Amino acid sequence: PLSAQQLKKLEEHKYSASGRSLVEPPMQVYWNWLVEKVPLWLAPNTITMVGLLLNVLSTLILVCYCPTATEGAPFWTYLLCAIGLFVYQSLDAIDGKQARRTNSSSPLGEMFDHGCDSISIVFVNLGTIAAVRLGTLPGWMFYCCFVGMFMFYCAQWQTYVCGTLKFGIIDVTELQISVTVMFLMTAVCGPELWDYEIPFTGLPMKTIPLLGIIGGTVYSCSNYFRVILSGGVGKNGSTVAGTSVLSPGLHIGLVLLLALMIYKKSTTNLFLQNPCLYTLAFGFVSAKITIKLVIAHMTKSEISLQDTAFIGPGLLFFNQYFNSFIDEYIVLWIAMVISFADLLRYCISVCLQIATHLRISVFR
Amino acid sequence: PLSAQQLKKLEEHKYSASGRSLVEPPMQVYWNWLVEKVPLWLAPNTITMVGLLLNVLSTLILVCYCPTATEGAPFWTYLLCAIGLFVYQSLDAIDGKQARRTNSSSPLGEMFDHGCDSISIVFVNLGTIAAVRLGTLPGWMFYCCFVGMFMFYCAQWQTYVCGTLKFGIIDVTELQISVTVMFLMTAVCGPELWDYEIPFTGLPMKTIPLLGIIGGTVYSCSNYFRVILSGGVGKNGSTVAGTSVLSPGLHIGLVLLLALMIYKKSTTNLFLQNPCLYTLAFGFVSAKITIKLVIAHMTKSEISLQDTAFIGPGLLFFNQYFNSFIDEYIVLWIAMVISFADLLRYCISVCLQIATHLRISVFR
Ligand SMILES: Nc1ccn([C@@H]2O[C@H](COP(=O)(O)OP(=O)(O)O)[C@@H](O)[C@H]2O)c(=O)n1
Ligand SMILES: Nc1ccn([C@@H]2O[C@H](COP(=O)(O)OP(=O)(O)O)[C@@H](O)[C@H]2O)c(=O)n1
Ligand SMILES: [Mg+2]
Ligand SMILES: [Mg+2]
Ligand SMILES: [Mg+2]
Ligand SMILES: [Mg+2]
């Protein structure tokens, strides 16, 4: 999975990040106080795995009770989702702090952190789509999920063009806090709160989050794109690996364009009837693509545009080309299963290789 | 177009071929007698260019008077085709002999010979399809043209796996002689000769050539495939370049499979109504692919499966995917023009680079 030269360049890697947000000081104090009361013999990898597992299980439960994201759910699911998200954020901060001390830092930890972040953001966007019941506005339904995916990939990609993480003021902390408080408010008030049309403007309440999200969208994009153009660390304005500046753009554009092309020619309402399956399959594809870029920018190697991850999308596209010989409901399940198995195999193989080389005992 | 190392390996190349056919001695004596009466100041490249030009012009005239390969043509076209084919064979033998003497041999000459052979075999197969009026048997119409293309590519490919050309007993000489005599017989007797159903077996006369061709087909394939499997020249049974044995098979399979896939889902009789345009576009594609393999096996480099020659087939495939927004008659013309321009540009660039390096003055 990893070549000898690339693995050799993996060592002597120094993690670096600069930036601060508005709510950073108080939550920072809280996380510091909580990490003073953590057991000393616990490994950070177990912490991040536990956090990701809790978040995934809770979001999966919420999705299972709300297919198509247009029905209602009890307070049980919303409360569990809020608790899981809060615990995920807390464990992220705590295992970061505990890995920074007691000389347990390793390059595999950052890889685990980034992969967990990808999966968690996909599941969080699914949960916040299902909770608000955004099935009454079919126009704004592709955009939300796939713009969350696109923004995470763009953050990784602008990190590729530079050497240090740059943190803004509207970063993940505020997003997670807002989503948690929104889940709590929906649980306490009921799923019909977003059907409490505001006495003016003739628009429902669901426009209040969405518009803001769009605003944040633009803002985030702005920053990222600047680092794409003005930023340069190598011998020129090119990437740190010496390759072209806009290579990952082709990967993300291919994924999103292929998703849109399959969506627009379904002829049987493939997406508006099975949104969770569609989003999960393409989220696994995008998660593998993002992990590849994470590994690429940890080292100084180069990425290609030929992967054994377009199997599922390829099957969908070639089953759409021929008119119909397999109904477009089992093909989606096959694609999701293939993508999940491929991502799991890739992650397990890379983790095993790194553990064998550095004799880390990943879980210890 | 040619890398420095590959161009350096181009030099110190020795042409080698072994084999003999049944009719080789008499035609060999004739060609020797004719080359004793050739001017000494004429370059072989001009000879092969003249032969290819005559063959192409005559076949183009015959095709223009017989679109769809189901109408009749005057004796003028058939006589011109027979004369052009005979002159092409004669000039091939003569310029080969004249290049072998008077120290004018160069690696560019073999490249010209192979490219001319590719174009000539494509046009000869079109001419023999049009002359026999094989439009009354739509089942056996894809097979003929594309099996001619496939056989030439397979001959080149088995040459790739070894170092020397192997000549059988049913080689190009007998094919050309048979086609010439068939053109002469059709001209003297008329296009209706193939509508003179043989008093027995209840089959028309056009089965007499076709079956034989099929037989020859199998025979040729046999020999080639043996060299594909038993043959080995490098450190192992692999190719002389050290790469995989069955890499060009992917190229030829992609071309033929894509042609068949576009043919089988035309919905408007794209091939059975415009056979000459279809065959010419895919013949230009296959000619460029074959020239690439010729250059590869002249040197010891490696070929890829990513070319700027699938533009035309890509446009056809993606215009078929979307139902129809451009009628499937201008797209074919665009594809043919693009393929022809690409092949001409590639050939001109390679010829200019070789002439600049070796200061040959190609035409002199
Ligand atoms: N399981 C883990 C998680 C993080 N780490 C390391 O600990 C550092 C602290 O990360 P963090 O979570 O505080 O930082 P951010 O989450 O803000 O990116 C990471 O950059 C990794 O190098 C680790 O070694 N093992
Ligand atoms: N225009 C040409 C044609 C052939 N030649 C060379 O002359 C040799 C004789 O080829 P040939 O035509 O007698 O052989 P075949 O046609 O049987 O392959 C070729 O192998 C080339 O090396 C050349 O230098 N310039
Ligand atoms: Mg962390
Ligand atoms: Mg994290
Ligand atoms: Mg010759
Ligand atoms: Mg020749």
Author numbering:
A (entry chain B), B (entry chain A): 20 to 383
From the article:
In eukaryotes, two highly homologous enzymes, cholinephosphotransferase-1 (CHPT1) and choline/ethanolamine phosphotransferase-1 (CEPT1) catalyze the final step of de novo PC synthesis. CHPT1/CEPT1 joins two substrates, cytidine diphosphate-choline (CDP-choline) and diacylglycerol (DAG), to produce PC, and Mg2+ is required for the reaction. Here we report structures of a CHPT1 from Xenopus laevis (xlCHPT1) determined by cryo-electron microscopy to an overall resolution of ~3.2 Å. xlCHPT1 forms a homodimer, and each protomer has 10 transmembrane helices (TMs).
We determined two structures of xlCHPT1 by single-particle cryo-electron microscopy (cryo-EM). The structure of xlCHPT1 in complex with CDP-choline and Mg2+ has an overall resolution of ~3.7 Å, and that of xlCHPT1 in complex with CDP and Mg2+, ~3.2 Å resolution. Density for two Mg2+ are prominent in both cryo-EM maps, and the Mg2+ are coordinated by side chain carboxylates of Asp111, Asp114 from TM2 and Asp132, Asp136 from TM3. We define the Mg2+ that interacts with Asp114 as Mg1 and the other one as Mg2. Densities for CDP or CDP-choline are clearly recognizable, with the cytidine ring coordinated by the side chain of Asn64 and by the backbone nitrogen of Ser124. In both density maps, there are tubular shaped non-protein densities resembling two acyl chains at the entrance of the slit, suggesting that the slit is wide enough to accommodate two acyl chains.
